[PDB]
């Protein structure tokens, strides 16, 4: 049906707008950018004026 085809096109448009694999990739890239490592030292005197 033409209505079914139009609904399928609209749903495909919504799904393309909602991939989110790039969102997960952005999160992983943010984690890689952070890449911290700490706590080998505990008592760290943060002497600040």
């Amino acid at each position: 049906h033409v209505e079914g085809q139009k609904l399928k096109q609209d749903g495909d448009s919504f799904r393309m707008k909602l991939n989110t694999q790039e969102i997960f990739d952005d999160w992983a890239r943010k984690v890689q950018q952070r890449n911290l490592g700490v706590s080998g030292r505990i008592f760290t005197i943060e002497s600040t004026r």
Partner: peptide, 28 residues
Amino acid sequence: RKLVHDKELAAEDEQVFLMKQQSLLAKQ
């Protein structure tokens, strides 16, 4: 009677503690 003479009981100052701690951090 040997009055008092109780070693002048007092602790290191918190600023003095900060100084010694900064010294330790420099040693760290």
